[PDB]
Amino acid sequence: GSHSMRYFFTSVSRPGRGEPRFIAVGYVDDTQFVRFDSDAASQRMEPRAPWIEQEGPEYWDGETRKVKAHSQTHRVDLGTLRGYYNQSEAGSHTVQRMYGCDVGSDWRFLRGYHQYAYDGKDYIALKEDLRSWTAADMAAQTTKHKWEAAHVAEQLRAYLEGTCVEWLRRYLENGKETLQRTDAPKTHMTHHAVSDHEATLRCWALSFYPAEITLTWQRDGEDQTQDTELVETRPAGDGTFQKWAAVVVPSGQEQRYTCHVQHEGLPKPLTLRWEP
Amino acid sequence: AQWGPDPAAA
Amino acid sequence: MIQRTPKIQVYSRHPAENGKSNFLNCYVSGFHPSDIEVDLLKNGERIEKVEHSDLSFSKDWSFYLLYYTEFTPTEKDEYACRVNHVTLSQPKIVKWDRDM
């Protein structure tokens, strides 16, 4: 299947005193592998998966240098944007950045992205061809002109199409035992009576990896989206994910209803029914 | 690994 | 400032079986800004040893965190997640229900 490497950065100003709170995290697919937190004691990029602990001191030194520099870019940015937006010195504000690369099943480059936000709104993002920028408003257009004059897109494009992919491939190999393993959902159904005439059937998917999953209900073999509820996929806390989908049915008609589960770890159709 | 050396300022 | 209120789910890491150790999770997502106060409660009292994930966010910029602690469920003990955020007038409590 397909794979991705993504980095996420959040800076939040502390206008009364000191530098922003800065939190950076990196993922391969749905696995967090590194972190930096400005409030933590180490002031180093830190490992969060066993397979990145292979990397030597050079790696940790380079990743720390880069993340610290990034934190200072956001320090300055929070000032600059305050000014672009004519905002006072009193309030806290937020800069977010995410970037990364997707690759296909052949592990070749598919697409890259680099998006930036101020106070949770779109600000500037690299277009899909990695050669120009989408600026949402006039402040961001000022940023776009700066980044065009300094040839930022060209640097980023070379990272996203090359370096990002190469490191992604290194990680998938080095962490193969987990990163290339798929964990199929563990499924079951439960039944819950509301009244004498209505029941809920809930279809459960537990302990799966990666997080991408589809749960669907049919009634007599036809798609049923009416009277359904689907919770957001959620992390279990041990690296795997969970989801359920429910349907409300007339009690006594449960056998008409089937839950269908698609996931990368399933080679074949999974269907569940309440025969119990 | 991260994009480096340092993102350009906004 | 865009303000977005947190969605909350409260649930166990593993299937819940009375008498057997486990982990209680409170997953908060969809919120902005990032300042949030999340507590796990046992029979209405704050649990002291609660850890959380490192802050991250969705493509729509909204944040998400996982708060978690060890626990051993029983028939009679009640568990809940209490959240406060600038969008909430009063704290929001979601009870842990083992069917959800």
Numbering used by the authors:
A (entry chain A): 1 to 276
B (entry chain C): 1 to 10
C (entry chain B): 0 to 99
Sentences from the paper on this structure:
We also solved the structure of each unligated APL to investigate whether structural changes occurred before or after binding — which, combined with an in-depth cellular and biophysical analysis of the 1E6 interaction with each APL, demonstrated the molecular mechanism mediating the high level of cross-reactivity exhibited by this preproinsulin-reactive human CD8+ T cell clone. The unligated structures of A2-AQWGPDAAA, A2-RQWGPDPAAV, A2-YQFGPDFPIA, and A2-RQFGPDFPTI were virtually identical when in complex with 1E6. Apart from the case of A2-AQWGPDAAA (KD = 61.9 μM), these observations support the conclusion that the higher-affinity ligands required less conformational melding during binding, which could be energetically beneficial (lower entopic cost) during ligation with the 1E6 TCR. For instance, the A2-ALWGPDPAAA, A2-AQWGPDAAA, and A2-RQFGPDWIVA (KD = ~208 μM, KD = 61.9 μM, and KD = 44.4 μM, respectively) were all entropically unfavorable (TΔS° = –2.9 to –5.6 kcal/mol), indicating a net change from disorder to order. For example, all of the stronger ligands encoded larger side chains (Arg or Tyr) at peptide position 1 that enabled new interactions with 1E6 not present with the Ala at this position in the natural preproinsulin peptide. These data also explain our previous findings that alteration of the anchor residue at peptide position 2 (Leu-Gln) has a direct effect on 1E6 TCR binding affinity because our structural analysis demonstrated that 1E6 made 3 additional bonds with A2-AQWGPDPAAA compared with A2-ALWGPDPAAA, consistent with the >3-fold stronger binding affinity.
We demonstrated that the TCR from the 1E6 T cell clone bound to HLA-A*0201–ALWGPDPAAA using a limited footprint and very weak binding affinity. Here, we solved the structure of the 1E6 TCR with 7 altered peptide ligands (APLs) determined by our previously published combinatorial peptide library (CPL) screening, 2 of which mapped within human pathogens. Concomitant with our global analysis of 1E6 TCR binding to the APLs, we observed a common interaction element, consistent with our previous findings, that utilized TCR residues Tyr97α and Trp97β, forming an aromatic cap over a central GPD motif that was present in all of the APLs. Ligand engagement is dominated by peptide interactions, but hotspot-like interactions with the central GPD motif enable the 1E6 TCR to tolerate peptide residues that vary outside of this region, explaining how T cells expressing this TCR may cross-react with a large number of different peptides.
